[PDB]
Amino acid sequence: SVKEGAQRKWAALKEKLGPQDSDPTEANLESADPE
């Protein structure tokens, strides 16, 4: 449930990989450095 749950969500990640619509404010969240 815990290990599988992560996979189900990971799949969504790929969905974004397709398109090239990544906000600058959002990217900062994932990244550690302030930039």
Contact criterion met (CB below 8 Å) for 16 and 9: no
Would you call 11 helix, strand, or coil by DSSP?
helix
Chain-centroid distance of CA 3 in Å reads 17
Read off φ and ψ for residue 21, nearest 5 degrees: -115, 80
| Distances from the Cα of 30 to the Cα of 1, 4, 34, angstroms | 25, 22, 11
**28 Cβ contact partners less than 8 Å away, ≥ 6 residues apart:** 34, 35
Contact criterion met (CB below 8 Å) for 28 and 35: yes
What are the structure tokens assigned to 23, written together?
Answer: 């906000």
What are the structure tokens assigned to 3, written together?
Answer: 């290990």
Cα torsion 12, 19, 21, 27: sign: positive
Q: Distance (Å, rounded) from C-alpha 17 to C-alpha 12?
A: 9
Experimental determination technique: NMR
Contact criterion met (CB below 8 Å) for 33 and 27: no
